[PDB]
Design a protein around this ligand. Structure first.
Ligand SMILES: Nc1ncnc2c1ncn2[C@@H]1O[C@H](COP(=O)(O)OP(=O)(O)CP(=O)(O)O)[C@@H](O)[C@H]1O
Length: 276
């Protein structure tokens, strides 16, 4: 169930849109004075081929997945708008995890890192406890939005951008692109199936990037085919630093296991991370 907002129920402020299927605007709900992000669906008729205009299904997939999710560590969908088709999402004020980690002169302090780690873990835990489980398929640092970087804040990090997300009681397949973040069983061929355990692998890469501030696999340089082979067949993984807490190292290593079934349930992951 998703409520409908009219053009008068919200007021626009500005644009900040790097949108995949349109434009993103900042705005406010007239009722709450609540700050809000507006994601529009813009079909460029003078832009793309009839196969490219299948970004409609992405906008759709997002709406469908978002309508069932209600968790503090997942970006909330307030409602839907028409003409154009628009998603009304809560505004997350501190940017995303990818851009914040680029700032080397200002490293995130240890306690805040843990808040971020646990925040994302709780979000994904929620996703995997759904019936059927939510497979995000695009878990990476740009898709983690930062609510606050204060260690005592209610919510520090939120999971976002469920556009390529799949929710099926059966098996899910499809070759994914962004290989440095994605499970080995998702990057080799479309001809093989995978589960929500792929997200558990992606999460390990997110744990690594928070811990080191560095891009996963940035320490290596291979051609695409050689890179995919190493990850799949030779167990190529980013190097966990020697000073990393023993319990965090174990969580990361189990979460990026080549064998998907060895990647832990998030009840275990949350518990382990909370002991850090
Ligand atoms: N709820 C929100 N709160 C604050 N900013 C948001 C937001 N939703 C989107 N944005 C911003 O609007 C822009 C739109 O990006 P979008 O959400 O479409 O991801 P994307 O698909 O562009 C990631 P990539 O470029 O890697 O594919 C981003 O810069 C993001 O920071």
């Amino acid at each position: 169930r998703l409520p409908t907002l009219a053009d008068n129920e919200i007021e626009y402020e500005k644009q900040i849109g790097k949108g995949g299927f349109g434009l993103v605007h900042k705005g406010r709900l007239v009722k709450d004075k609540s700050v809000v992000a507006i994601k529009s669906l813009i079909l460029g008729d003078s832009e793309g081929e009839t196969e490219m205009i299948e970004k409609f299904q992405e906008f759709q997939r997002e709406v469908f997945i978002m309508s069932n999710l209600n968790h503090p560590n997942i970006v909330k969908l307030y409602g839907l708008m028409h003409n154009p088709p628009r998603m009304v999402m809560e505004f997350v004020p501190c940017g995303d995890l990818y851009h914040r980690l680029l700032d080397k002169a200002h490293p995130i302090k240890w306690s805040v890192k843990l808040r971020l780690m646990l925040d994302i873990a709780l979000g994904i835990e929620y996703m995997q406890n759904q019936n059927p489980p939510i497979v995000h398929r695009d878990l990476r640092s740009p898709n983690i939005f930062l609510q606050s970087l204060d260690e005592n804040a209610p919510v520090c990090a939120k999971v976002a951008d469920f556009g390529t997300s799949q929710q099926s009681v059966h098996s899910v397949s499809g070759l994914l692109g962004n290989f440095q973040w994605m499970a080995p069983e998702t990057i080799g061929a479309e001809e093989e199936s995978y589960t929500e355990k792929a997200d558990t692998y992606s999460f390990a890469m997110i744990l690594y990037t928070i811990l080191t501030g560095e891009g996963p696999f940035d320490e290596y340089s291979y051609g695409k085919i050689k890179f995919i082979n190493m990850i799949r067949e030779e167990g190529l993984r980013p190097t966990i630093p020697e000073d990393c807490p023993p319990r965090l190292r174990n969580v990361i290593e189990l979460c990026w296991s080549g064998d998907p079934k060895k990647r832990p349930h998030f009840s275990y992951i949350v518990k382990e991370l909370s002991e850090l």
